[PDB]
Write a protein that binds this ligand. Structure first.
Ligand SMILES: Nc1ncnc2c1ncn2[C@@H]1O[C@H](COP(=O)(O)O)[C@@H](OP(=O)(O)O)[C@H]1O
Ligand SMILES: [Mg+2]
Ligand SMILES: [Mg+2]
Length: 358
């Protein structure tokens, strides 16, 4: 009952990954309330050309204008499940497409993609099959939970600075000027709901989207979306090389799955200011490591992910929303499976199960 993760096992040709299409969206407001619309979407608004360059003081507003989301509340798939409930009769494909699909969060798939190269943080994924559909929901590991409650001040401030960068680069209205005098409230989120397919595995997943570029060439989502990122300033080829090997892998995996074509990075100096920007097209990120003996390979990422979905599908035989197959993985080891029922691992809520049953 095990799945190996070594990169050399997955080194063949790039598998088929269907162009993702956006089926819908939803927003979570400042009170973490769900709305089935795009009210939370912000608009890409980078520093005006022929004006002063970026000069963003991410160290502005922390912590008195910071309203961090309560991470103790474990929402699991609940918001995505509400979207599915409100769109189940109106999904594309045809009869029984949902019954053949795997439903999860984009970030869960990102963790699968990076697993062959990940050497720091393990994970756990709870799986339940219900009306044919395979649902995947991450479980916080004991080490992750302990790390979270013991987050050092530096890490808490670094997390704020990543969200603060968005406030310098986005506006509430197209063409608007970004307003950093306000609050960073990380309850607020705009999520895109996407359909794709990896190999023979249809996928339905949602992902948080940083902003929309109204000047983007392609007007149809997800091609108009932009991912915003921060990273430390780099000054030597060796620093850039380490960035290419480790960070860009994570950025690629996150933006490749939903079809977000550009990541815009602000580089922060040690005093907390962003004074330079650079755009990384998702489809060109691998070029930085293609001829690197210590690089990553997107074919390995996707072939492993396909192998895991096959492994999970074959492992979860029983159609039962109270039954959970927990997939556990630590760096260097295989993915292992354990079986559980009801609390605490069961994650499909009665309100979803009963509505789908009726
Ligand atoms: N797994 C994680 N652990 C701790 N902080 C995280 C995190 N994922 C995201 N963050 C914070 O959320 C911000 C927005 O995420 P995202 O870039 O994916 O849109 C991140 O900014 P950065 O990505 O610039 O570090 C980071 O500050
Ligand atoms: Mg984001
Ligand atoms: Mg971002």
């Amino acid at each position: 009952p095990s799945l190996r993760t070594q990169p050399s096992l997955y080194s063949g040709p790039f598998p088929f990954y269907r162009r993702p299409s956006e089926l819908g969206c939803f927003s979570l407001d400042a009170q973490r309330q769900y709305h089935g619309d795009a009210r939370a979407l912000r608009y890409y608004s980078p520093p005006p050309i022929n004006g002063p360059g970026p000069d963003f003081d991410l160290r502005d507003g922390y912590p008195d204008r910071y309203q961090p989301r309560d991470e103790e509340v474990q929402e699991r798939l609940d918001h995505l499940l509400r979207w599915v409930l409100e769109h189940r009769n109106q999904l594309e494909g045809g009869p029984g497409w949902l019954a053949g699909a795997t439903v999860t969060w984009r970030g869960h798939l990102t963790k699968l993609l990076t697993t062959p190269y990940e050497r720091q943080e393990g994970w756990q994924l709870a799986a339940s099959r219900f009306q044919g559909t395979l649902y995947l929901s991450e479980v916080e590991t004991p080490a992750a939970r302990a790390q979270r409650l013991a987050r050092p001040p530096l890490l808490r401030e670094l997390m704020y600075m990543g969200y603060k960068f968005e406030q310098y680069m986005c506006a509430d209205k197209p063409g608007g000027s970004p307003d950093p005098s306000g609050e960073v409230n990380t309850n607020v989120a705009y999520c895109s709901v996407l359909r794709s397919r990896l190999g023979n595995h249809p996928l339905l997943f949602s992902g948080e989207v940083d902003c929309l570029n109204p000047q983007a060439p392609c007007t149809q989502p997800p091609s108009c979306y932009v991912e915003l990122k921060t990273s430390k300033e780099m000054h030597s080829p060796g620093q850039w090389r380490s960035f290419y090997r480790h960070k860009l892998l994570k950025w690629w995996a996150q933006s490749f799955l939903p079809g977000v074509p550009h990541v815009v990075a602000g580089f922060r100096n040690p005093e907390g200011f962003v004074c330079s920007l650079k755009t990384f097209p998702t489809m060109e990120m691998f070029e930085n490591v293609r001829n690197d003996r210590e690089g990553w390979n997107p074919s390995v990422c996707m072939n492993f992910c396909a192998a895991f979905l096959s492994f999970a599908q074959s492992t979860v035989v029983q159609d039962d929303p109270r039954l959970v197959h927990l997939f556990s993985w630590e760096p260097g080891g295989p993915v292992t499976v354990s079986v559980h029922r009801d609390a605490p691992y069961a994650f499909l809520p009665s309100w979803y199960v009963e509505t789908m049953t009726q």
